[model samples]
Target: VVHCDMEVICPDGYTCCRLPSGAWGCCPFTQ
Candidate 1:
């Protein structure tokens, strides 16, 4: 899981997904 404050650090080709408890996760797009 990722932190909400770290979401801004996500680079291109990646995105942050919001989970329960205000948590976040990094997910890259699949080709």
Candidate 2:
């Protein structure tokens, strides 16, 4: 799954992602 390594995203992930609940959040995994 194209997910971020960070535990929480919307806090400092900057990037965005579509949630399973039909929403969006921060998704960054460039580490």
Candidate 1: TM-score?
0.51
Error of 2 at 26 (Å): 1.0
Model 1: worst 10 consecutive residues (lDDT sum): 1-10
lDDT tens readout by residue for model 2, 1-31 = 3345444344353576767986667655678
Candidate 1 residue pairs in clash (backbone atoms < 3 Å): none
Evaluated with TM-score, which candidate comes out highest? 1
Clash-forming residue pairs, model 2: none
lDDT of 1: 0.64
Total clashes in model 1, counting residue pairs 3 or more apart in sequence or in different chains: 0
- Model 2: how far residue 27 lies from native, Å: 3.2
Candidate 1 displacement at residue 17 in angstroms: 0.4
Which parts of model 1 have CA positions greater than 4 angstroms off?
1-8
